[PDB]
Amino acid sequence: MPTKIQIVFYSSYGHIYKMAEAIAAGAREVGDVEVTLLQVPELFGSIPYATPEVLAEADAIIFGTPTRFGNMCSQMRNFLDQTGGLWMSGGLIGKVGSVFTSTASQHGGQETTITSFHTTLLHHGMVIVGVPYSEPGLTNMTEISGGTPYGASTLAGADGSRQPSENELQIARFQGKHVATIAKRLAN
Amino acid sequence: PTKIQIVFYSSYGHIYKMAEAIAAGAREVGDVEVTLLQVPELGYRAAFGSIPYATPEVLAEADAIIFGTPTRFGNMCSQMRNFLDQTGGLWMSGGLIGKVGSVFTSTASQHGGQETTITSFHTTLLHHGMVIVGVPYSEPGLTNMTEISGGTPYGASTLAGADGSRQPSENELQIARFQGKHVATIAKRLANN
Amino acid sequence: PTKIQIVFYSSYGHIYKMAEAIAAGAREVGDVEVTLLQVPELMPEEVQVKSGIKGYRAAFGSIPYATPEVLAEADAIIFGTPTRFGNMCSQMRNFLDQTGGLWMSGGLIGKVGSVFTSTASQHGGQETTITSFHTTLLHHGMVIVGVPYSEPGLTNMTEISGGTPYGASTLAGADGSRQPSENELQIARFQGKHVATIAKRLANN
Amino acid sequence: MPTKIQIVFYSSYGHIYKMAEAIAAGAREVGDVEVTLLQVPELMPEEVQVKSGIKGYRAAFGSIPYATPEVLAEADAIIFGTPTRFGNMCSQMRNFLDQTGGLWMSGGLIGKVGSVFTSTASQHGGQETTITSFHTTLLHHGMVIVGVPYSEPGLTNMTEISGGTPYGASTLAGADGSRQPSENELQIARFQGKHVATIAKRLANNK
Numbered sequence A: 001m002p003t004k005i006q007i008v009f010y011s012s013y014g015h016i017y018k019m020a021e022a023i024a025a026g027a028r029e030v031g032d033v034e035v036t037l038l039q040v041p042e043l044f045g046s047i048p049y050a051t052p053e054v055l056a057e058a059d060a061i062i063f064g065t066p067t068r069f070g071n072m073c074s075q076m077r078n079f080l081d082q083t084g085g086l087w088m089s090g091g092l093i094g095k096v097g098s099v100f101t102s103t104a105s106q107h108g109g110q111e112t113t114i115t116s117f118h119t120t121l122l123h124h125g126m127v128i129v130g131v132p133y134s135e136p137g138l139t140n141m142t143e144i145s146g147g148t149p150y151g152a153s154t155l156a157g158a159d160g161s162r163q164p165s166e167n168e169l170q171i172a173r174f175q176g177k178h179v180a181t182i183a184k185r186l187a188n
Numbered sequence B: 001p002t003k004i005q006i007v008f009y010s011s012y013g014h015i016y017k018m019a020e021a022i023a024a025g026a027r028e029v030g031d032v033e034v035t036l037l038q039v040p041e042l043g044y045r046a047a048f049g050s051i052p053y054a055t056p057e058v059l060a061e062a063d064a065i066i067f068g069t070p071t072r073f074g075n076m077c078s079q080m081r082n083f084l085d086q087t088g089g090l091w092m093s094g095g096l097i098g099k100v101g102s103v104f105t106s107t108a109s110q111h112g113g114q115e116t117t118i119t120s121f122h123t124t125l126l127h128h129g130m131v132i133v134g135v136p137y138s139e140p141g142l143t144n145m146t147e148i149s150g151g152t153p154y155g156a157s158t159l160a161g162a163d164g165s166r167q168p169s170e171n172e173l174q175i176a177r178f179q180g181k182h183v184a185t186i187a188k189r190l191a192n193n
Numbered sequence C: 001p002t003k004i005q006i007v008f009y010s011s012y013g014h015i016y017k018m019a020e021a022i023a024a025g026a027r028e029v030g031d032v033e034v035t036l037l038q039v040p041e042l043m044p045e046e047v048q049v050k051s052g053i054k055g056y057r058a059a060f061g062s063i064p065y066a067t068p069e070v071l072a073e074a075d076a077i078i079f080g081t082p083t084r085f086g087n088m089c090s091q092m093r094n095f096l097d098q099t100g101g102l103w104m105s106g107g108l109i110g111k112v113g114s115v116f117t118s119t120a121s122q123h124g125g126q127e128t129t130i131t132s133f134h135t136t137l138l139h140h141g142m143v144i145v146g147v148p149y150s151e152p153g154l155t156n157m158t159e160i161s162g163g164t165p166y167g168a169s170t171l172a173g174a175d176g177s178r179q180p181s182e183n184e185l186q187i188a189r190f191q192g193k194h195v196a197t198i199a200k201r202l203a204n205n
Numbered sequence D: 001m002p003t004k005i006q007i008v009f010y011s012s013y014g015h016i017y018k019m020a021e022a023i024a025a026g027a028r029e030v031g032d033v034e035v036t037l038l039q040v041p042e043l044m045p046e047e048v049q050v051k052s053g054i055k056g057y058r059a060a061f062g063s064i065p066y067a068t069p070e071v072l073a074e075a076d077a078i079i080f081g082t083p084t085r086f087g088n089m090c091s092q093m094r095n096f097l098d099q100t101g102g103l104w105m106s107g108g109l110i111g112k113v114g115s116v117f118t119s120t121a122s123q124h125g126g127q128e129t130t131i132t133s134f135h136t137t138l139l140h141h142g143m144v145i146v147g148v149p150y151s152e153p154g155l156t157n158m159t160e161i162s163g164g165t166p167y168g169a170s171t172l173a174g175a176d177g178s179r180q181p182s183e184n185e186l187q188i189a190r191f192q193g194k195h196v197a198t199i200a201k202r203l204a205n206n207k
């Protein structure tokens, strides 16, 4: 085709960035896909800034945002608030949408951040994909871990110093491959 | 054929009427098989008493499942909740993973759970690993501003009024037909690949 | 007195009109001080003027801007935001993202929090915008108040209307041309009075 | 008159019951208060209760009186406990609440404090969404919603796996229900009970 997977993210201290690398790695496990990383501007490198126009080109868009009190961050919100023209044109209708996040605390918006993000994706006419429980990481009870059936996640700790765990990255890779696979099936 | 199940609870018929519209829409897609299934209870229901009962096991046969429930204070009704609470074995084996899931509802008032009933339902569908489909704004009914209307981007809906005397409007039923066709199209694309 | 702050963002004035009604309701309770505050705009200068938003916003230009610090002084904060695809708008999001210091100091813990919104379509985030907003208020340790069904407006079935048990709302139509109805404003007044009453009861401990 | 707190819960294997006793202990700390635990009726067929072992586990708290919809009107605050079922409250709790249409139309719960706690098998399988979806129902009832403020240190624990959310206390049962509530989880529940009781008392003594 190739099937086009965009990973649109904002990262403050690298947790979402590292998770985005993992989502990307997973999507890249599926043949005939083109993975494009896009970063969200604040209010170097060759990761372009997301624009509303470019989102139209995707078959799937996987969004990553750190939480801000259980909602997506203002940087992501501001970017999405600029997609009214894209909405008017039906630009994302029928495309696969998926979300991953990061939080400071164990249950401070690990889930709510994602489900509230889903709302916006639904207004854009997207089909929503999370992480199924066929991924063993989701049921881990041996170590503190992110990862939700709604989408992958990581924990940054109170001071932002915690690095994403191998369990959390595995879940994100799973999410990427799963989203890419569904998108490819829908696109062919 | 692509298999679509429409699994619903209805007390006074509003959700049943919507389910028939969903079904009509689904059947507008080639090579699909659409089955209405009613959720067991824990006069109006006799008017559709020839619809078979849904069982948790049979869900595994569908490519898409479209769930209908009246609201109960912004959540699905207990009859539906009890049905879904019986899908633990199906969850264990990953029986609904990758199947298309979609929801429609009915409420008494204009903003008493027209949306929250559906989004809380989506939570459960995601635990089952389903692909969630709502109603895109390509459906004009969603932006109707000339009459009181159900219909949400999260899924179709109708309004029954305080006494339950209001019947689904043409606009609400057309939105439901669209959802049925939309879901069946997406499911067919998945089932064939 | 019991202090009620109504913090809002508005682009074309719908939320601002609802905010005035919320204020009016809150004032119906004795010994209350009600203050409107607005959040900073993020939209580029040229976009504001090109979209006609600059003109509408200039209408309420005299309203002071909220700051994180000032929020501490309230007994209740009622937040108004237009929906953006079923979430609060980025202007409100950015203001709240600046309240980390306030969060660390537990500055809004035990305060009454409440929300109202505005949407283009009948069921395009009339409810989900508000419930997602509640999430944030809970992280701040706020007590959440909506609109009880003792307000008859919530069950009106004779005319298209905003108003939810989660918080008041209005509908702006596809072109934004619809203005708040009397039913919608009445529900907002009730919300304001209901919130103020709860806040007063809690504050006078 | 004493502030009245009801803790209304469903439990299959006892996790929610244990959290409920911790919530109650916390509520009792405020003084001039009456805290009552009430359980909702079981829906599971008798044979299933027996073969699943649930009959036996529930018997451990079988003497807790059963809540009825009308009794809820007696409380200043109601704290609801439910295990998650795929990120919603369980059907037992749902059926009980579906029976509160009378209270709803009479405004019987308006202005009362409502609060929620939960239990899940996995770390992020509905620890939050079960609670936020519950809040929807409580808002239809016109209740004042209270969660758990971050003044509770347990919420930011990053040394051990723990439940506890700013939306309400929670515990983790593990994939097979083998995990029992931790001290951290019970501490958070205790705080929730005290916090809810404090808010309710302030509202109650200011009629």
Ligand SMILES: Cc1cc2nc3c(=O)[nH]c(=O)nc-3n(C[C@H](O)[C@@H](O)[C@@H](O)COP(=O)(O)O)c2cc1C
Binding pocket: A080, A081, A082, A083, A084, A123, C009, C010, C011, C012, C013, C014, C015, C016, C082, C083, C084, C085, C086, C117, C118, C119, C120, C121, C122, C123, C124, C125, C172, C176
């Ligand atoms: C970028 C953008 C996205 C919007 N998305 C929706 C939407 O998805 N659903 C909806 O019903 N209204 C939507 N609206 C409409 C509004 O929220 C807004 O026009 C209306 O509430 C006016 O409030 P205000 O005059 O205070 O700004 C959107 C508006 C904008 C600018």
Ligand SMILES: Cc1cc2nc3c(=O)[nH]c(=O)nc-3n(C[C@H](O)[C@H](O)[C@H](O)COP(=O)(O)O)c2cc1C
Binding pocket: A010, A011, A012, A013, A014, A015, A016, A017, A065, A066, A067, A068, A069, A070, A101, A102, A103, A104, A105, A106, A107, A108, A109, A155, A156, A160, C096, C097, C098, C099, C100, C139
């Ligand atoms: C303003 C602000 C508010 C936050 N509030 C919460 C919160 O309430 N609960 C929580 O668990 N984490 C909260 N966080 C934590 C972050 O989201 C965390 O820093 C993030 O996961 C870091 O990932 P990043 O490096 O990609 O930005 C907050 C962070 C910020 C900046």
Ligand SMILES: Cc1cc2nc3c(=O)[nH]c(=O)nc-3n(C[C@H](O)[C@H](O)[C@H](O)COP(=O)(O)O)c2cc1C
Binding pocket: B009, B010, B011, B012, B013, B014, B015, B016, B070, B071, B072, B073, B074, B105, B106, B107, B108, B109, B110, B111, B112, B113, B159, B160, B164, D097, D098, D099, D100, D101, D140
């Ligand atoms: C116990 C109960 C609680 C209800 N609560 C609400 C409510 O809070 N908000 C609302 O808008 N409708 C509420 N309803 C109304 C319905 O959901 C309505 O009867 C339904 O749409 C009927 O569809 P059906 O005929 O297919 O069962 C409630 C109904 C019942 C029985």
Ligand SMILES: Cc1cc2nc3c(=O)[nH]c(=O)nc-3n(C[C@H](O)[C@H](O)[C@H](O)COP(=O)(O)O)c2cc1C
Binding pocket: B084, B085, B086, B087, B088, B127, D010, D011, D012, D013, D014, D015, D016, D017, D083, D084, D085, D086, D087, D118, D119, D120, D121, D122, D123, D124, D125, D126, D173, D177
């Ligand atoms: C039908 C069913 C579905 C469940 N689904 C989930 C789930 O999706 N996510 C989760 O984390 N736990 C899930 N659980 C596990 C429980 O909720 C857990 O066993 C419960 O908290 C035990 O509390 P109790 O002993 O008070 O009943 C499910 C349990 C059952 C029976």
